[PDB]
Amino acid sequence: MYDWFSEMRKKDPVYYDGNIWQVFSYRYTKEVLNNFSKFSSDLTGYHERLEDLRNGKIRFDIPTRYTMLTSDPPLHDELRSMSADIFSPQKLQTLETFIRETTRSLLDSIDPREDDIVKKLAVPLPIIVISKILGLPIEDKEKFKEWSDLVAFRLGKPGEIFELGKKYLELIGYVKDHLNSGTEVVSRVVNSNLSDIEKLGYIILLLIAGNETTTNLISNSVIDFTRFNLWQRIREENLYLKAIEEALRYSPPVMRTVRKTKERVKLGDQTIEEGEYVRVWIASANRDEEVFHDGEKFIPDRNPNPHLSFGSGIHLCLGAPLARLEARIAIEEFSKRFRHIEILDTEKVPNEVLNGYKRLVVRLKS
Numbered sequence: 001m002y003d004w005f006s007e008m009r010k011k012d013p014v015y016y017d018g019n020i021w022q023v024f025s026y027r028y029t030k031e032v033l034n035n036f037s038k039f040s041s042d043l044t045g046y047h048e049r050l051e052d053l054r055n056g057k058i059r060f061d062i063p064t065r066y067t068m069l070t071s072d073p074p075l076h077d078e079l080r081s082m083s084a085d086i087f088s089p090q091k092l093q094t095l096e097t098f099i100r101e102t103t104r105s106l107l108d109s110i111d112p113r114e115d116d117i118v119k120k121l122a123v124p125l126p127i128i129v130i131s132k133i134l135g136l137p138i139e140d141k142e143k144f145k146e147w148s149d150l151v152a153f154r155l156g157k158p159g160e161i162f163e164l165g166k167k168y169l170e171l172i173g174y175v176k177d178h179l180n181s182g183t184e185v186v187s188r189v190v191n192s193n194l195s196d197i198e199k200l201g202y203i204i205l206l207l208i209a210g211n212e213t214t215t216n217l218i219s220n221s222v223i224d225f226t227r228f229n230l231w232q233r234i235r236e237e238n239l240y241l242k243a244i245e246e247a248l249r250y251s252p253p254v255m256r257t258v259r260k261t262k263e264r265v266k267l268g269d270q271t272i273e274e275g276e277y278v279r280v281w282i283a284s285a286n287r288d289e290e291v292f293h294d295g296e297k298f299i300p301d302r303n304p305n306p307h308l309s310f311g312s313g314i315h316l317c318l319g320a321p322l323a324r325l326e327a328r329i330a331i332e333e334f335s336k337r338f339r340h341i342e343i344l345d346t347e348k349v350p351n352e353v354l355n356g357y358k359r360l361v362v363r364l365k366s
């Protein structure tokens, strides 16, 4: 994809084939993502039916169809308030030892001789931790992972259908059963003018949205650090944070997002019509030669690292702080225990707008 991005960046920053509009340069990607007035996130019809929703006239729809992720202000700001502060840093900092202890336990079940860290570390960590934060148990840890795949949240054009199914009913059932023993976060939502579906959409989101992505981050970080052998340096020079950010910039978990214009707008040259869809390539903008000097090189130092892997603007990842903490602790402990890693086998995730691994097997050697 990158060689393609390079060409588009130089020749056509804003390109329009037949259907959708594409943006490859840092500059416009940021302009599009930030200007929530001309590039909407109202892609599931959360707006043109909020009232019906609020006046309890809609109940057999897909819950996840109504979450802040696919909302515009004022609706957006109202929904985010309810949880903006629960994930904030320092309020999340009270979780460091739990994540550390957990990580250690998980690492313990790894066979230095040969094992799969995606299955042993990458996948477990984010779920165990999100479960702890929300108070919803995960006895499924498999039948649960099945729902995560169904509910997706991979930031592409919305699923046109929105019709129920049995697996989706299982999930909605699980949620209602434990919706009680939840933490403060859950209670805030459970006690709001929010329609009941909106409440379910909200929970499902916080509980599934970031597991896949955070697992991929931890995976990409492991490959990359090895790929360019930076473990020794990162370890001693102590640059875990800056290194995770290069990881996020170089190998972003999600390579793009979409927006829809609600007004005819001019984008630095071309002019996009009202109604059209816009696919914003985060992965491209992250290697934009003009903002990132040596953007094609993995520089663990790279201090001012203003990458767009978490978004930019009012929708900036609500869980950015948490993803960062987990990835850092996971990587810290992982390197403090093996001082040697050799990649035996890896299987990328199929989807070509994602950066992650089906499974990654390594030989650590004590």
Ligand code: HEM
Residues within 6 Å of the ligand: 033, 041, 068, 069, 070, 080, 155, 205, 206, 207, 209, 210, 211, 213, 214, 217, 252, 253, 254, 257, 258, 308, 309, 310, 311, 312, 314, 315, 316, 317, 318, 319, 320, 322, 323
């Ligand atoms: C390394 C992992 C992660 C990456 C790369 C990531 C990336 C993203 C991106 C790029 C957006 C922006 C969507 C847009 O602007 O159109 C976003 C939004 C969001 N992410 Fe994440 N995310 C990650 C982890 C998490 C985690 C751990 C959670 C925690 C619950 C989470 C929850 C959300 C939520 C709720 C939003 C909605 C924000 C809003 O609309 O105000 N993310 N994420």
